[PDB]
Amino acid sequence: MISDSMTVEEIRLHLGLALKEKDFVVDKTGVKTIEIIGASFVADEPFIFGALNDEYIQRELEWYKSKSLFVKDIPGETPKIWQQVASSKGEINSNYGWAIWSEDNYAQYDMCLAELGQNPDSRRGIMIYTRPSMQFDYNKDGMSDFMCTNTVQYLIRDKKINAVVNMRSNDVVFGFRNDYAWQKYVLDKLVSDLNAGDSTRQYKAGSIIWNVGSLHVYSRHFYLVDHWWKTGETHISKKDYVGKYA
Amino acid sequence: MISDSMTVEEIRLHLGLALKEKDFVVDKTGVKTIEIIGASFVADEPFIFGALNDEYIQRELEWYKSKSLFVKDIPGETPKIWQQVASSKGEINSNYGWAIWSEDNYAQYDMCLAELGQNPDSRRGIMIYTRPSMQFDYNKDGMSDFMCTNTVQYLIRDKKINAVVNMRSNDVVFGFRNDYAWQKYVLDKLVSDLNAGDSTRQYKAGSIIWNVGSLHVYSRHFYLVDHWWKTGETHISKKDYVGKYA
Amino acid sequence: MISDSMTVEEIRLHLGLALKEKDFVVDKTGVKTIEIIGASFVADEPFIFGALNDEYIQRELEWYKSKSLFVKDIPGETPKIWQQVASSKGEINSNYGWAIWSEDNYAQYDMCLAELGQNPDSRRGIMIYTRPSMQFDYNKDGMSDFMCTNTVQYLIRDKKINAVVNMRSNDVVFGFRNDYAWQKYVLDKLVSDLNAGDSTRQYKAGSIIWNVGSLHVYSRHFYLVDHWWKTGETHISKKDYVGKYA
Amino acid sequence: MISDSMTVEEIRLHLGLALKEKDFVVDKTGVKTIEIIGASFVADEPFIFGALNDEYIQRELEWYKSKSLFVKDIPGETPKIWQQVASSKGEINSNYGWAIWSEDNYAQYDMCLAELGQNPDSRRGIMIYTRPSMQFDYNKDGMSDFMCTNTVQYLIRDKKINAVVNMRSNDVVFGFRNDYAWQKYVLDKLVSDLNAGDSTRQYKAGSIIWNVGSLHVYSRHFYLVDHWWKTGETHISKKDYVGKYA
Ligand SMILES: Nc1ccn([C@H]2C[C@H](O)[C@@H](COP(=O)(O)O)O2)c(=O)n1
Numbered sequence: 001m002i003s004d005s006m007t008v009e010e011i012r013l014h015l016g017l018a019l020k021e022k023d024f025v026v027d028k029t030g031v032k033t034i035e036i037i038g039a040s041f042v043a044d045e046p047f048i049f050g051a052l053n054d055e056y057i058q059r060e061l062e063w064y065k066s067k068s069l070f071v072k073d074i075p076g077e078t079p080k081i082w083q084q085v086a087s088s089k090g091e092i093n094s095n096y097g098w099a100i101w102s103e104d105n106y107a108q109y110d111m112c113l114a115e116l117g118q119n120p121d122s123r124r125g126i127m128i129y130t131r132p133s134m135q136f137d138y139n140k141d142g143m144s145d146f147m148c149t150n151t152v153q154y155l156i157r158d159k160k161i162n163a164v165v166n167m168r169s170n171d172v173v174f175g176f177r178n179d180y181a182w183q184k185y186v187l188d189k190l191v192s193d194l195n196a197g198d199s200t201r202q203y204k205a206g207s208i209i210w211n212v213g214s215l216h217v218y219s220r221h222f223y224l225v226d227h228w229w230k231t232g233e234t235h236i237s238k239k240d241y242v243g244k245y246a
Numbered sequence: 247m248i249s250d251s252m253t254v255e256e257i258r259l260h261l262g263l264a265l266k267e268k269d270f271v272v273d274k275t276g277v278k279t280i281e282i283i284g285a286s287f288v289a290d291e292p293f294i295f296g297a298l299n300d301e302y303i304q305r306e307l308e309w310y311k312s313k314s315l316f317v318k319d320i321p322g323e324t325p326k327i328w329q330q331v332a333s334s335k336g337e338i339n340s341n342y343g344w345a346i347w348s349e350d351n352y353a354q355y356d357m358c359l360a361e362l363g364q365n366p367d368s369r370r371g372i373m374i375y376t377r378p379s380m381q382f383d384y385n386k387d388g389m390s391d392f393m394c395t396n397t398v399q400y401l402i403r404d405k406k407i408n409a410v411v412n413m414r415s416n417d418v419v420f421g422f423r424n425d426y427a428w429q430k431y432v433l434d435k436l437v438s439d440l441n442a443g444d445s446t447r448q449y450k451a452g453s454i455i456w457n458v459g460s461l462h463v464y465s466r467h468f469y470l471v472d473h474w475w476k477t478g479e480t481h482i483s484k485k486d487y488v489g490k491y492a
Numbered sequence: 493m494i495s496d497s498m499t500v501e502e503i504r505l506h507l508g509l510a511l512k513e514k515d516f517v518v519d520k521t522g523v524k525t526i527e528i529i530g531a532s533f534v535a536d537e538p539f540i541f542g543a544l545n546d547e548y549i550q551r552e553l554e555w556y557k558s559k560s561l562f563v564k565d566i567p568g569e570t571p572k573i574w575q576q577v578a579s580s581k582g583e584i585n586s587n588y589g590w591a592i593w594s595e596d597n598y599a600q601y602d603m604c605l606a607e608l609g610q611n612p613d614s615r616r617g618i619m620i621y622t623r624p625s626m627q628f629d630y631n632k633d634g635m636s637d638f639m640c641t642n643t644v645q646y647l648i649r650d651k652k653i654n655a656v657v658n659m660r661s662n663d664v665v666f667g668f669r670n671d672y673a674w675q676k677y678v679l680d681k682l683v684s685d686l687n688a689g690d691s692t693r694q695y696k697a698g699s700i701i702w703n704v705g706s707l708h709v710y711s712r713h714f715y716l717v718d719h720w721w722k723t724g725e726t727h728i729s730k731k732d733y734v735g736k737y738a
Numbered sequence: 739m740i741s742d743s744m745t746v747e748e749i750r751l752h753l754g755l756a757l758k759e760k761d762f763v764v765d766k767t768g769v770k771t772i773e774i775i776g777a778s779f780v781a782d783e784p785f786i787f788g789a790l791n792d793e794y795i796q797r798e799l800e801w802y803k804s805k806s807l808f809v810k811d812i813p814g815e816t817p818k819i820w821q822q823v824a825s826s827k828g829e830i831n832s833n834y835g836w837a838i839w840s841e842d843n844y845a846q847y848d849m850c851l852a853e854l855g856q857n858p859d860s861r862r863g864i865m866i867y868t869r870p871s872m873q874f875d876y877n878k879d880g881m882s883d884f885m886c887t888n889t890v891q892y893l894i895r896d897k898k899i900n901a902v903v904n905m906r907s908n909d910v911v912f913g914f915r916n917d918y919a920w921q922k923y924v925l926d927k928l929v930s931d932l933n934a935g936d937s938t939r940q941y942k943a944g945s946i947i948w949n950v951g952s953l954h955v956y957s958r959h960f961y962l963v964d965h966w967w968k969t970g971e972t973h974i975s976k977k978d979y980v981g982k983y984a
């Protein structure tokens with residue numbers, strides 16, 4: 001059986017409770033955050049707070065597909081968040097396409113596919129993003145990029161494929177929305193590739209279980225939580241917002 | 247805030263429900279298991295079903311401390327479970343002492359200690375057990391040992407250090423009891439070392455949160471689940487047991 | 493006066509000298525090239541090395557005429573070189589017909605025609621291919637197509653119309669042959685259209701001056717340079733070739 | 739290899755030959771010019787004919803740094819050449835600081851720096867000054883300013899950075915001296931910024947290659963060419979000059 005987990009709605013409630021109680025934690029940049037530690041929930045919605053920007057997600061998907069570890073290869077103008085985190089040559093660590101499709105990271109996609117193709121019940125169907133050398137690699141050439149995704153395991157039960165996503169650190173507003181788009185993409189891909197290998201498999205995408213060490217909102221997005229707490233709306237324009245989180 | 251997780255007592259209940267409903271899954275050895283996928287609970291007891299064998303746990307601790315990748319170096323008679331999984335030269339992968347203390351695995355314990363000593367609020371305080379090359383390493387020289395522990399992250403909040411344990415696969419009866427004893431040991435050690443570096447820290451051991459891709463019971467231990475379901479006792483002698491799981 | 497420039501024969505000689513001296517530069521694909529920087533010569537021959545394929549050039553002319561930015565609209569089977577450089581929807585940037593005849597690129601042909609029709613001596617008769625936004629456009633939707641032609645200026649002196657072609661990057665073997673066919677076409681067109689406006693003009697096509705930032709040969713075509721260096725023949729079948737550039 | 743180009747001394751010779759032969763072309767103002775079409779030379783001197791006025795060049799540098807498209811913002815008294823070419827509100831197009839540093843022109847300097855910092859061997863390292871809409875923009879609000887510089891490309895070879903400057907039109911006497919001072923400034927800046935990003939790069943300024951569609955001298959400066967032809971002096975006072983170009 002799949003575990004009886006929280007949903008995104010209940011995560012929203014706990015994040016609102018945390019802000020209500022001023023349970024703040026100081027980020028490495030010096031700014032405040034609210035936070036749930038050891039979060040586990042079914043990702044039954046594609047975002048938590050904020051708006052869906054399918055345009056950005058598609059540019060990031062194309063970058064993942066290229067497997068490039070240089071932020072300039074992100075289609076179009078590179079987001080400043082990617083610029084500030086990059087090395088002195090424009091390099092990073094956290095291209096998730098490189099992580100699962102590069103032979104440099106030991107063919108994570110292909111090996112998980114072969115595993116599950118040979119034994120559908122396997123507990124060893126897993127894609128390993130992070131690496132032991134990350135202790136030293138995260139600030140190579142002055143980058144600041146310690147891999148936030150650790151592992152994603154895939155379990156086929158009742159002809160549905162469930163993903164168990166293990167993250168170290170996930171921003172609620174931008175992080176989860178982008179990362180979920182990615183994990184949903186890869187799950188759909190895996191289902192396709194297994195079904196294409198044998199037409200009697202008839203697998204379907206199951207649940208994505210999201211496990212996060214520190215799931216947090218930054219102070220600049222507190223107004224989103226505050227507004228939802230008052231009104232029940234998961235998004236406002238920063239201009240239309242009124243309340244103490246200015 | 248720390249998430250509102252299940253406790254061991256609730257995990258027992260769900261496993262008892264899975265057996266009651268005959269929710270069986272076939273293991274790679276061909277034997278049946280019951281199973282919870284994407285389990286997440288606070289490890290608030292040192293075992294789930296069965297009895298505590300402090301003698302064995304101490305021998306396995308001594309083996310971890312040696313950092314030896316050979317099963318003959320387990321003090322005394324090497325258990326058969328370790329023999330059947332070892333390579334042709336008696337080698338394995340899953341010595342957790344090697345994983346956190348060897349320089350070959352990039353000094354996991356020391357680097358996580360240095361991180362947390364420099365920034366107590368860090369989300370980057372983590373010990374990475376598994377590795378990308380595990381896709382190929384798990385059956386080197388004919389061993390069968392795919393690393394079950396992925397990562398353990400440590401978060402200091404309110405002067406308590408919480409451990410978030412991410413496992414791929416965990417046997418409920420033997421695995422959890424031994425693995426919990428290990429993770430408790432390391433958490434206590436980390437607290438001590440951080441406190442020894444500065445006497446004003448005054449950190450204390452917090453919660454151990456257990457995240458398991460597949461948390462399962464093998465058919466040979468079904469009689470334990472069944473007996474608990476009927477009586478509420480978490481252990482019987484296999485000889486004293488009466489019921490249909492013989 | 494028109495400047496005393498190199499000819500194609502002298503370009504051949506310098507390219508042979510570069511290969512002789514192993515003056516190699518590593519392409520972005522990881523492969524080797526020889527190269528002349530800041531090349532300037534009169535294009536007094538329709539190719540440098542290799543053979544003329546009038547069949548391909550005509551298919552590319554028809555695509556230019558359609559002004560389509562999708563590579564599938566190239567008549568017949570699309571060359572793989574155009575496929576690998578295209579976006580995820582089959583789109584590119586470098587349709588030169590779009591560049592000079594589209595109203596989206598500000599009517600370059602028509603405006604240059606009007607300029608030269610009004611003042612034959614003008615220094616402002618120019619067709620601008622590239623654009624400032626090319627810094628961001630070159631990898632839109634995952635294409636890899638940074639416009640190689642910058643500008644072509646047209647100067648009418650002594651009743652002859654001279655073209656000054658400014659390119660960023662030009663492949664010696666395929667690039668120059670195709671691109672020259674195009675630039676010769678447009679020059680002949682411009683002469684026709686100006687003569688048709690006034691029968692007393694009697695303009696004639698003059699010289700095409702080719703200016704290239706990086707004029708290069710890829711390693712897979714080194715055998716052409718090598719063979720010419722030994723024999724003086726500007727083409728061999730790859731099968732008939734014998735020498736160290738296999 | 740860098741192409742074997744003419745030097746400034748040879749350009750002087752060809753201009754002296756053109757005047758000797760009365761190879762005149764009528765300017766748009768109705769005045770005569772001598773002219774070299776498709777000129778390409780290494781700028782190995784900071785001027786061709788005339789005298790260096792470091793005072794004026796510094797004022798024009800300060801104007802470029804402000805990025806202002808209004809000629810009144812040139813420090814001190816705005817030169818009449820800039821007044822007669824400006825629009826009804828004093829606006830122009832050809833502030834080169836605006837061209838390379840404004841976000842309105844798509845961040846030319848920064849993007850070329852990011853390209854070359856990521857791949858030193860790149861052929862895509864370029865600053866695009868002009869734009870397709872210049873066909874309409876050159877006489878906006880009655881200005882007369884059609885961008886004279888098209889593109890400048892930068893190529894790093896043998897740890898030297900070579901600039902390839904592509905101009906549509908360049909006055910030999912005032913234009914080249916001012917424009918060269920500008921391009922030298924930017925090349926030195928780019929070297930500094932690349933070296934500051936990584937101390938092992940150790941790049942040095944290479945050659946500036948000057949490519950001009952129409953390189954010309956106006957009739958009011960013919961006395962300079964004539965005097966040099968006779969004596970070899972690259973400058974005279976107009977009062978001290980004696981000869982038929984009065
Ligand atoms: N795909 C990603 C990459 C990064 N992060 C966020 C999580 C943290 O807010 C920050 C990483 O910081 P740290 O390394 O300090 O956790 O980036 C994320 O949510 N998802």
Ligand SMILES: Nc1ccn([C@H]2C[C@H](O)[C@@H](COP(=O)(O)O)O2)c(=O)n1
Nearest residue numbers: 123124392394415416417421422425
């Ligand atoms: N420290 C460990 C090592 C192994 N296992 C158990 C979990 C599975 O029952 C088995 C590994 O099998 P698989 O690799 O098929 O998951 O070993 C465990 O519980 N804890």
Ligand SMILES: Nc1ccn([C@H]2C[C@H](O)[C@@H](COP(=O)(O)O)O2)c(=O)n1
Nearest residue numbers: 638640661662663667668671861862
């Ligand atoms: N009409 C074209 C289009 C492209 N290229 C060649 C020049 C380079 O070999 C490559 C472009 O690569 P880069 O953008 O890296 O210069 O394509 C060319 O010669 N002519």
Ligand SMILES: Nc1ccn([C@H]2C[C@H](O)[C@@H](COP(=O)(O)O)O2)c(=O)n1
Nearest residue numbers: 615616884886907908909913914917
């Ligand atoms: N930075 C600049 C700007 C302009 N010009 C000169 C070249 C021509 O003499 C004139 C522009 O005229 P046209 O647009 O007719 O070429 O200005 C120049 O030399 N350099």
